[model samples]
Target: LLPLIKVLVVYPSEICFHHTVCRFTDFLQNYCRSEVILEAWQAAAIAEMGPVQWLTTQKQAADKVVFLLPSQDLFPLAFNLFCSDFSSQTHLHKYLVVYLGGADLKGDYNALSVCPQYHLMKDATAFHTELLKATQ
Candidate 1:
């Protein structure tokens, strides 16, 4: 299985960050009827994903790069990157889902953070799931 990456959520104001997250979650759960569990003032730095396959693994690089613009209904950028080089465009129309998009989700070998405990794939997966649920 491809290794999952970790993503961190940090901001300037700890209290503001947590409070905004709580509000967002409440909106998702109450107004949107979605279960988005968010807590305030809670900043977490997670580094879960594996290698930067796109940069380090040429064989898998094509699977990692993508172009996404949600406002235009664009998604799953990796597929577009794949189609640009290959054929059988049938897959382009299919619904696509991406689990890795966080700016803080660094690769395993990219850097050695002072806080190493945040590097965990399980946590990344949970964060991804929760974000997906909130958006949905």
Candidate 2:
């Protein structure tokens, strides 16, 4: 059996993809038979809390950090800050970055693709497969 995993999902302020995170978390818990404790925060909060400080603090408790990079202007800048902080903490390497884009935002993925860890989702089926591969 897979061990219980603590997941911290940090996202941008945009309303997009919150539902995707929710559904994916639900699948992780229900279908995958994994215990998932999900904690989420917006990128805006990182400025006040300090990116490295906040991530390291959370890293102590999380087995995985899933970054939801939506296709938005603020998200690109915020993701850059997050990645910079994340790189310094080698212990937090067990993380997944999912790029959220569809037909409307297909051409807007240049920013999301810049991150080395970012995985562009081809579809729900592909994402599910990737999620299982990542968590396992």
Candidate 3:
């Protein structure tokens, strides 16, 4: 059998946004044939580890990392992107930003803006195709 793409999908702390982010992970698993990990779902384990450590461990383990912007609890994308050996365009494609309310995450995230971003609903189909291309 072919290997599954391991995806880490981070969600916002606000529960209202959880449903929207959940839909994307569902698509990743059902349609893209990817193994999905919800960052918020592993609450206890993450609390035990240092925040940065969790970020380090999860992203390194997964084949791809996806962040749902507008979350205060999210692993600092800028910290990892700038410090990690993210150059050579290696780590760039491995990460993706899926945002619901924008104009902020894209602009403030600065470095992460370089990554491929798709709106949670407005660009659903486009993100689907992009996700497939990413696995390639």
Candidate 4:
């Protein structure tokens, strides 16, 4: 078997992508066999997703953070709050940004170009390999 990687995924705060994040997490956990946290469902999951104490702890515990970028539907700026909330220790280079548009964007991916992430498309199989490359 393999070690269950400590991975956490954070999606921009818009109802638009909740289901996307939720589904992707399931794929990653099943394929990567890693302990991926989605926290998208509010059992009070929404209203309660905000215990700074809870996040600060879980966020610190997570070994990697994945950002689910929407398909040309939004800008990266949307993630600022989530990033700031968790990445307090710029102890740099642990995030793997996955774009929803894969192998076909001609615009500008400069943000991710240097950061070393994978091209995307909810291709869990592809993401499976890339995730290993990022954290393995």
Best by lDDT: 3
- For residues 1-136, what per-residue lDDT tens digits would candidate 2 score against the true structure? 3545666665554456567667666655776444553335345555776666555666566666666665344344445555554544565355566655421332233433333354444454554454456455
List where candidate 3 sits over 4 angstroms from the true fold: 75-88, 101-107, 134-136
Q: Write model 3 residue lDDT over 1-105, tens digit each, in one string.
A: 355578877655565566666666777888767888767577787789856677778878877777667534564542454334433376657777777653233
Return the lDDT, model 4, position 78. Answer: 25
TM-score of 4: 0.59
- Cα displacement (Å) at residue 18, model 4: 2.7
Give the distance in Å from residue 83's predicted Cα in candidate 1 to where it truly belongs. 17
- TM-score between candidate 1 and the true structure: 0.22
lDDT of 1 at 94: 20
- Candidate 3 accuracy as TM-score: 0.71
lDDT of 1 by residue, 38-92 (tens): 1122213112232222322322322212121110111122233333433235422
* Best first by TM-score, ranked: 3, 4, 2, 1
Q: Give the candidate order by descending lDDT.
A: 3, 4, 2, 1
TM-scores of all predicted structures = 0.22, 0.50, 0.71, 0.59
Kindly provide the TM-score of model 2 when superposed on the true structure, using C-alpha atoms: 0.50
What are the per-residue Cα lDDT tens digits for candidate 4 across 1-136? 3555677665565665666666667767776777876554322543464444344555577777676666622224323334443334563555667766322332344445334366555465666775576554
Query: Number of backbone collisions per candidate, in order?
Result: 9, 0, 0, 2
Q: List all candidate RMSDs to the true structure.
A: 15.3, 5.8, 3.7, 5.9
The candidate 3 region of ten consecutive residues with least summed lDDT is 101-110
